[PDB]
């Protein structure tokens, strides 16, 4: 019943595209990992061996890269990652109000996932939008936090 | 067609150069860029020798906008004294706290950057160029990918560009969470598919970089100047602002100001003017307590009349201006800076590894009123001892801002020593 | 080395044949062409009999891309029924409004064209071939001259090509401003050093052409297919697109589209698909009002579902697609078409000569609101009477598109008669 | 008394030797002459006819027929502007207006210095890039006045 892990063809194609993009295959490692995280909602540990084969890299090389880069998550599956900036400017301008509003709406704190697997709050360093502090992302979308009522409306768009 | 949601960061210019289009918060595609005379500088560049282009960039007084202010033309000259092949890298990792100047060019006027890359690549004889954009800028990434395709279709990229015989492909790579990948040698490591571990310098990238070959790394803002230099000529460019620090500079202003955003200004502008003349003054008209130059320096209210140039007494850096006012707790702000370096040391060097962590660890105890006497003296010691043996700038500076707050705001820190 | 400046026309292909290289906007020289397996079709061709090549081209169902869609094989057959010597002519006059498909092959993939000319010439027993390129394509002219020299140097042109015993010279002639010199008999006149005056057909060129000898005239696009037919065989070629109207076709799309350029598509594609699927839809997402098939036909927004084939109900022609949207004045557009025919009639035939002039002259008065009732009646009359006694297709069609705008957009013309 | 300078006579002779028959080179020869002088000198036609072994009559008729040849006006640079349907639809008038702003001339006219002549032409076969113009052999899409101005400054 249990078989060696295999990339669904639609994902494999995407991975192969990245690998073919740069002059050397191994330059595509981060784009491939982003792709895998996008597809599964995290990095499955079992995905790394075949990825390594595709990159013509040793597994431990790949594992070390996944460990190094903070955007990748081998631990928790989540459909939507709410990245909340916890750096100086957002802190000054009201990170704590955003986190409170998030707790009120979703019932979770930083590092936690909602029981439905839908949302994970991820504390991150400066997102490079400090003039619009306090800043958060929902997957690739990026926003200024204004108020709980405004946050609730934004989150309602992710289903 | 559709890109991820981006905040509409305010942008304003007195020079109408780097922000000529990017002052409007939307993607400017190639047709709009062409209407404004875009890619004509490239056409002009391709009729010049590489050597002449280097000379022009040299004479313009252009300095890197990535933070160190290194003379761009001189950097290029160092590269081309080394045998090819050579590589050209645009550093779009912008991850310093308070710094959001590069992204508005990327996301709004991508062709300005691309045109700069093509000219710069031609000048140093690079046939392969990279943009390394941080992973938390997904919109910028997609915007750049599409802009590059637009440029290919118009024949500004590819083989034999406009019959010149110059070949170029630009590859767009994405980061994945590490601030240290903005350090030029860790960036290269990342482009080679490895962890972002800085290399010992020298050698500098211009001698040994990507695949060990001569490599120029330049910041987004730096590269965006290059079309203007060619278009206007170096003499006319050097007429902008003070002649020793000529040309536009971008200033990302955040915190307790009325008009936070990116300002394009000449470098004789003072810090006071940036805050009060351009950024609308402070929220609630409160007194300025301090300005953090990103996570690098802390200026007091007694230091506002300095020029925003790369002089010894100048503001320098990336021109990042974070304003704190009279009610902002300096120790709380220092903690946030400590937290930043804690989370970003790559851990290769021992004093950086343990110092970044301990600085944050002990400062948190201080802030929370839980520090022993030992923790206090420990914090002081570690703050002075992150730098030893460090092989990149992060270890060199991780205690710097915090040290400045200790010197400039002793009364506030003492309040916590009692607590 | 250096050529005059060219705009970088956008080009896209779903078939990766004619535009395999020409989809990239630059000159592809012989080494790059050879790397892609170029000139191997020629080598194969020279190992075949002329008759066999004609046979394959016939069975391919290749049709002319110069506008009439005449079966190419059949044309060649006709030529070789007539005693030699014979001449081969490549028609690169491309001057019909909206039509810029041929130039991107000339300017970007000249060896594809040249290889086609050499095979075609061999098939019909021509030892002397011509490219007639319009004079407003100066870069195309210099590019071809250089490509021909490249081919000479690699032994693809000259005497006894590749030991085959077949000799060929390709001469490049230039036009000098006359659209009519794209008409095959007027082209031949121009090659003979005269004014571009069409000859009464029949005879067709394949019977009597250059210096009175059997002559095949084919369009650039037509000839560019020939290497593919020899390379793949006719069976695989016939497998491209629908079985009857098989093979690639080029579609130059201009006007109110998001992505104007040349599209290489199969002929089962609909007009609507060209506009909305490939060319990115309309500028401003405005409603399509009309499509001008060059200066030949006018399609309304109710005719977008037609195939881009040579069927009775199909688009046909050169596949030229000029898009007008809801804001564009049909009468103003018709005026521009009238002006074109006025500026291009060669003047041989009286109704064409006076008709093209009066159509433009009167339509301008109508447009400026200076037309009497008699000017209105006269306009109608002359539009219907350009064709009588005409000896070529220009006279036959000079009123066609404009007539269609009168039939299809009556309410907009009516407003001008006020 | 009119005779071609030798370097031109050479070029004409190359064209005449290129095709199997001399008379086929008539249009190439006339382009060459117009390139050299910036127009077709009326006086050039007689000696050309001699080199082609054609009657002068024949040559005059050909010059008259082919619209690219100009016997009236010398100009260093011919700005050929497309006035056909697609370019008209996409902004020929903006181009002409920009041209008037920069050069101070309308179609048909030459600048006082004899440098630029604006020539209205039929479709140049570049319609995707409408509105189109050429400056001698170079061809461009018009984007804006600022863009046009920079292009024109390249011709001195
Ligand atoms: N824009 C942003 O988001 C960030 C900016 N930074 C800035 O980074 C700065 C430190 O950067 P570094 O690269 O360590 O500075 P650096 O002073 O060592 O070098 C700056 C540039 O000059 C070149 N260079 C220096 N000496 C050279 C020589 N002898 N020969 C050839 N090239 C030479 C280096 O290769 C580099 O490209 C800080 O001032 C900080 O503001 C830091 C983090 C993020
Ligand atoms: N590609 C471009 O830029 C342009 C295309 N055109 C097109 O030109 C077309 C009109 O062209 P024509 O040459 O008058 O068409 P046609 O129907 O008379 O002839 C088409 C071709 O087939 C040959 N042919 C036809 N019947 C033949 C027979 N019984 N025996 C031998 N050969 C025969 C002719 O010699 C010619 O080569 C229009 O449909 C228009 O779309 C017009 C202007 C420019
Ligand atoms: C820890 C750390 C982090 C960064 C840097 C340095 C260090 C020490 N540098 C500066 C970088 O190493 C280099 O100086 C510039 O990229 C060179 O470009 P310019 O000369 O400024 O154009 C840097 N530069 C940049 O352009 N973007 C960035 O995000 C960063 N990040
Ligand atoms: C007024 C006028 C103008 C043109 C044409 C016709 C007429 C009536 N024809 C068509 C030409 O006479 C002939 O049919 C083709 O060149 C034959 O080649 P194919 O059979 O299409 O390959 C034509 N064909 C072409 O290849 N290019 C051109 O520019 C023109 N121009
Ligand atoms: S100083 Fe710190 S960040 Fe820099 S290489 Fe050493 S451990 Fe890494
Ligand atoms: S129909 Fe018109 S263009 Fe054709 S030969 Fe007669 S006069 Fe000339
Ligand atoms: S501090 Fe939060 S985006 Fe910069
Ligand atoms: S209509 Fe102007 S180039 Fe075709
Ligand atoms: Cl392994
Ligand atoms: Cl005589
Ligand atoms: Na932006
Ligand atoms: Na990064
Ligand atoms: Na360097
Ligand atoms: Na100064
Ligand atoms: Na072309
Ligand atoms: Na012609």
Curated annotation (Swiss-Prot), chain A:
Cofactors that this protein relies on: [2Fe-2S] cluster
Positions with a binding annotation for [2Fe-2S] cluster: 85, 90, 126, 130
GO biological process, one term: respiratory electron transport chain
Taxonomic superkingdom: Bacteria
Pfam families assigned to the protein according to its UniProt record, in alphabetical order: 2Fe-2S_thioredx
CDD domains: TRX_Fd_NuoE
SUPFAM superfamilies in alphabetical order: Thioredoxin-like (SSF52833)
This enzyme's EC code(s): 7.1.1.-
Annotated catalysed reactions: a quinone + NADH + 5 H(+)(in) = a quinol + NAD(+) + 4 H(+)(out)
Record InterPro entries: NuoE-like, NuoE_dom, NuoE_N, Thioredoxin-like_sf
One term of GO molecular function: quinone binding
Major enzyme class: translocase
Keywords, alphabetical: 2Fe-2S, Iron, Iron-sulfur, Metal-binding, NAD, Quinone, Translocase
Cofactor note: Binds 1 [2Fe-2S] cluster.
Record's signal peptide: none
PROSITE patterns with a match to the protein in the record: COMPLEX1_24K (PS01099)
Function: NDH-1 shuttles electrons from NADH, via FMN and iron-sulfur (Fe-S) centers, to quinones in the respiratory chain. Couples the redox reaction to proton translocation (for every two electrons transferred, four hydrogen ions are translocated across the cytoplasmic membrane), and thus conserves the redox energy in a proton gradient.
Protein family per UniProt: Belongs to the complex I 24 kDa subunit family.
Protein name: NADH-quinone oxidoreductase subunit E
Higher taxonomy: Bacteria, Pseudomonadati, Aquificota, Aquificia, Aquificales
Curated annotation (Swiss-Prot), chain B:
Pfam families noted in UniProt: Complex1_51K, NADH_4Fe-4S, SLBB
Amino-acid positions noted as binding FMN in the UniProt annotation, renumbered to this chain: 175-222
Enzyme class: translocase
Cofactor annotation comment: Binds 1 FMN.
EC number: 7.1.1.-
UniProt binding sites for NAD(+): 64-73
SMART domains: NADH_4Fe-4S
Reactions performed catalytically: a quinone + NADH + 5 H(+)(in) = a quinol + NAD(+) + 4 H(+)(out)
PROSITE patterns according to UniProt: COMPLEX1_51K_1, COMPLEX1_51K_2
Annotated [4Fe-4S] cluster binding sites: 346, 349, 352, 392
Molecular-function GO term, any one: 4 iron, 4 sulfur cluster binding
Disulfide bonds: none
CC cofactor: FMN; [4Fe-4S] cluster
Keywords assigned by UniProt, alphabetized: 4Fe-4S, Flavoprotein, FMN, Iron, Iron-sulfur, Metal-binding, NAD, Quinone, Translocase
Family from the record: Belongs to the complex I 51 kDa subunit family.
NCBIfam families: PRK13596.1 (NF010120)
Role played: NDH-1 shuttles electrons from NADH, via FMN and iron-sulfur (Fe-S) centers, to quinones in the respiratory chain. Couples the redox reaction to proton translocation (for every two electrons transferred, four hydrogen ions are translocated across the cytoplasmic membrane), and thus conserves the redox energy in a proton gradient.
Protein name (Swiss-Prot/TrEMBL): NADH-quinone oxidoreductase subunit F
Organism from which the protein derives: Aquifex aeolicus (strain VF5)
Gene: nuoF
Curated annotation (Swiss-Prot), chain C:
Residues annotated for [4Fe-4S] cluster binding in this entry: 346, 349, 352, 392
Functional summary from the UniProt entry: NDH-1 shuttles electrons from NADH, via FMN and iron-sulfur (Fe-S) centers, to quinones in the respiratory chain. Couples the redox reaction to proton translocation (for every two electrons transferred, four hydrogen ions are translocated across the cytoplasmic membrane), and thus conserves the redox energy in a proton gradient.
Binding site for NAD(+): 64-73
Binding of FMN, residues: 175-222
Cofactor note: Binds 1 FMN. Binds 1 [4Fe-4S] cluster.
Organism per entry: Aquifex aeolicus (strain VF5)
EC number(s) per entry: 7.1.1.-
Alphabetical keyword list: 4Fe-4S, Flavoprotein, FMN, Iron, Iron-sulfur, Metal-binding, NAD, Quinone, Translocase
Protein name: NADH-quinone oxidoreductase subunit F
Cofactor or coenzyme needed: FMN; [4Fe-4S] cluster
Gene Ontology terms for molecular function: 4 iron, 4 sulfur cluster binding; FMN binding; metal ion binding; NADH dehydrogenase (ubiquinone) activity; quinone binding
Family membership noted in the UniProt record: Belongs to the complex I 51 kDa subunit family.
Record field: catalytic activity: a quinone + NADH + 5 H(+)(in) = a quinol + NAD(+) + 4 H(+)(out)
One Pfam entry name: Complex1_51K
The organism's taxonomic lineage, starting at the top: Bacteria, Pseudomonadati, Aquificota, Aquificia, Aquificales
Curated annotation (Swiss-Prot), chain D:
Coiled coil: none
GO BP of this protein: respiratory electron transport chain
Cofactor annotation remark: Binds 1 [2Fe-2S] cluster.
Annotated TM spans: none
GO molecular function, one term: oxidoreductase activity
Enzyme Commission number(s) from the entry: 7.1.1.-
Pfam entry (one): 2Fe-2S_thioredx
Needed co-factor(s): [2Fe-2S] cluster
UniProt KW Iron-sulfur keyword: yes
Gene3D superfamilies: Glutaredoxin, NADH-quinone oxidoreductase subunit E
InterPro entries: NuoE-like, NuoE_dom, NuoE_N, Thioredoxin-like_sf
Binding site for [2Fe-2S] cluster: 82, 87, 123, 127
Protein name: NADH-quinone oxidoreductase subunit E
Species classification: Bacteria, Pseudomonadati, Aquificota, Aquificia, Aquificales
Gene name tied to this protein: nuoE
